[PDB]
Amino acid sequence: RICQFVLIRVCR
Amino acid sequence: RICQFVLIRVCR
Amino acid sequence: RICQFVLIRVCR
Amino acid sequence: RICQFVLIRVCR
Numbered sequence: 286r287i288c289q290f291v292l293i294r295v296c297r
Numbered sequence: 298r299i300c301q302f303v304l305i306r307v308c309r
Numbered sequence: 310r311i312c313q314f315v316l317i318r319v320c321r
Numbered sequence: 322r323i324c325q326f327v328l329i330r331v332c333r
Contacts, residue, residue, distance in 0.1 A: 287321050287323075292304035294314040312332035320324035 286308050287319075288306045288308035290304070290318045291307055292302070292316045292318075294302045294316075296300035297298070297311055310333055312330045314328070315331055316326075316328035318326040320326075321322070
């Protein structure tokens with residue numbers, strides 16, 4: 286199984 | 298006012 | 310209205 | 322062998 290890199294930023 | 302970061306790996 | 314920053318990388 | 326990056330903004 287292959288894993289991915291999920292990154293998200295939230296600044297306002 | 299928001300300002301945070303969230304990242305996680307998804308092993309498929 | 311409010312936009313987010315979606316980032317994802319896949320390398321293996 | 323995979324290797325690519327993709328990021329886009331989601332204006333709500």
